[PDB]
Amino acid sequence: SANNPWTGFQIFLSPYYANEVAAAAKQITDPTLSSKAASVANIPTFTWLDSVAKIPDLGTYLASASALGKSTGTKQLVQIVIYDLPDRDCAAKASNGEFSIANNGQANYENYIDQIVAQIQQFPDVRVVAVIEPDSLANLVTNLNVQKCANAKTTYLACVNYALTNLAKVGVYMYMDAGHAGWLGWPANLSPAAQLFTQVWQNAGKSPFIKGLATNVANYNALQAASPDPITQGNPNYDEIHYINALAPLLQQAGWDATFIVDQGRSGVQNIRQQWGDWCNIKGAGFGTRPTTNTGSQFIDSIVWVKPGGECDGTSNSSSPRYDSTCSLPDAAQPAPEAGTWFQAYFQTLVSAANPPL
Numbered sequence: 346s347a348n349n350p351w352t353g354f355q356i357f358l359s360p361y362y363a364n365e366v367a368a369a370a371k372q373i374t375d376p377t378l379s380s381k382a383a384s385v386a387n388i389p390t391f392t393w394l395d396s397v398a399k400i401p402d403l404g405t406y407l408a409s410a411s412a413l414g415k416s417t418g419t420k421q422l423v424q425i426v427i428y429d430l431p432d433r434d435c436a437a438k439a440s441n442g443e444f445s446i447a448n449n450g451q452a453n454y455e456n457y458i459d460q461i462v463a464q465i466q467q468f469p470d471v472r473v474v475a476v477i478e479p480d481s482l483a484n485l486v487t488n489l490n491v492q493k494c495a496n497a498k499t500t501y502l503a504c505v506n507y508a509l510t511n512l513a514k515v516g517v518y519m520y521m522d523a524g525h526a527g528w529l530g531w532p533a534n535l536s537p538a539a540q541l542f543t544q545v546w547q548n549a550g551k552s553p554f555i556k557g558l559a560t561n562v563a564n565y566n567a568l569q570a571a572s573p574d575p576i577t578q579g580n581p582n583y584d585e586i587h588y589i590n591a592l593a594p595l596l597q598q599a600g601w602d603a604t605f606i607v608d609q610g611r612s613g614v615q616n617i618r619q620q621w622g623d624w625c626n627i628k629g630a631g632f633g634t635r636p637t638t639n640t641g642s643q644f645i646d647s648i649v650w651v652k653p654g655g656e657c658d659g660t661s662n663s664s665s666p667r668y669d670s671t672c673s674l675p676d677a678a679q680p681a682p683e684a685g686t687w688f689q690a691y692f693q694t695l696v697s698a699a700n701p702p703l
C-alpha cells in the first residue's frame with residue numbers, strides 16, 4: 346500500500362546474529378566458503394526476543410541504531426520478533442518457553458510487553474518493525490483439538506491483544522504471524538483463518554500500525570515455485586504467493602488494508618522434505634532470496650529473513666525435556682542442539698546451498 350515501512354530507511358544489522366556469523370565463519374575450513382559465510386552478517390535479519398532476559402539487549406540495539414543514524418545521515422529501522430507467550434509452542438515440544446499459564450503467565454507476559462514498550466519509547470527516532478508471536482494464531486485455527494492449545498486459547502488472544510494495543514501506542518509497525526501455505530493455505534482453512542485475524546485486528550482497535558501478516562516464518566516454502574513440491578499434493582496453494590493471493594481478498598472483504606511479509610531465509614532449496622509437516626532442521630536447506638521490497642506482488646511489502654539461519658529449531662536428543670520426534674526424522678539434520686542455539690554444521694550447509702549463491 347502507500348506506506349511501506351521499509352521505504353526510506355536503512356535496516357540496522359542484528360549484532361546478535363553478526364556475532365554468531367563471525368564466530369561461525371572462522372570455523373569453516375574452506376577459505377572461499379569462509380569469506381561467503383562472513384558476508385551473511387551484512388544481510389538483514391530479525392532479532393528474536395524469546396526471553397525477558399533479552400529486553401536489555403533491545404535497548405542497546407535501539408541506542409546503537411539511533412547513534413548510527415545520526416552519524417551517517419540516515420533513518421534506521423530495527424526488526425524484532427515478539428516470541429514469549431505463556432505455554433508457547435503449544436502443538437510441539439521443542440520451543441517451550443519460560444512462562445506458563447498456570448504460573449501467572451498472562452501477568453508475566455504483560456510485564457514483558459511493558460518492558461519492551463519502555464525501551465522503544467526512549468528512541469522515537471528509530472523505526473521498529475515487529476513480527477508478533479509466530480505460530481500462535483495458526484495453532485488456534487487448526488490445533489484446537491490439541492489440549493495444550495485449547496487450554497491456551499483465551500490467554501493467547503489476551504496476550505496478543507495486549508501486545509498489539511500497547512506497541513501501537515509507541516508507533517511500532519506490526520505483522521501478526523499467519524503460518525504458511527501448508528498450514529493455513531489449504532482452501533478449507535482460509536475462511537476460519539481470516540475470521541480469526543480480523544477479530545484480533547478489531548479487538549486491538551484497527552490501528553493503522555497493524556500492517557498485516559507474516560508468512561513462512563521459520564519454514565521452507567517457496568514464495569513462487571517453478572513447479573509444485575510433491576509434498577503439496579492436494580493443496581492448490583502450493584507456495585506462499587498462492588496462499589497470500591487467496592487470503593488477502595478475504596481480509597479486504599472485512600475492511601483491513603492488509604499487506605504481508607514473507608520469510609525466505611531458508612527457502613533457497615525446494616523439494617527436500619518427505620512430508621509438508623516436517624519443520625525441524627530440514628537437511629539440505631539453503632539460504633534463499635535476500636530481503637527486498639521488490640516483491641512482485643501488490644500484497645507483499647517485503648521479502649525478509651525472520652528465522653536466522655543457523656539457529657536450531659529443536660534438539661534431536663531424546664533425553665531432553667524439549668525433545669520433539671519431528672527433529673529425529675530422516676529429513677532432519679542430526680545430531681541437533683537445543684532450539685535457539687547455534688547449529689554450526691547446519692549453517693555451513695545453508696551457505697553452500699544458498700540460492701542465489703552468496
Ligand SMILES: OC[C@H]1O[C@@H](O[C@H]2[C@H](O)[C@@H](O)[C@@H](O)O[C@@H]2CO)[C@H](O)[C@@H](O)[C@@H]1O
Binds near residue numbers: 436480564621623
Ligand atoms: O512452520 C514452523 C512451525 O511449524 C509448526 O508445525 C506446523 C507445521 O509447520 C505445518 O506444516 C503443519 O504440519 O502443522 C504444524 C503444527 O501442528 C511447529 O509446531 C512450530 O514449532 C514451528 O515453529
Ligand SMILES: OC[C@H]1O[C@@H](O)[C@H](O)[C@@H](O)[C@@H]1O
Binds near residue numbers: 395652686
Ligand atoms: O532462532 C530464532 C528462534 O527460533 C525458535 O525456534 C527458538 O525457540 C528461539 O529460541 C529462537 O529465538
Ligand code: NA
Binds near residue numbers: 440563658
Ligand atoms: Na519452531
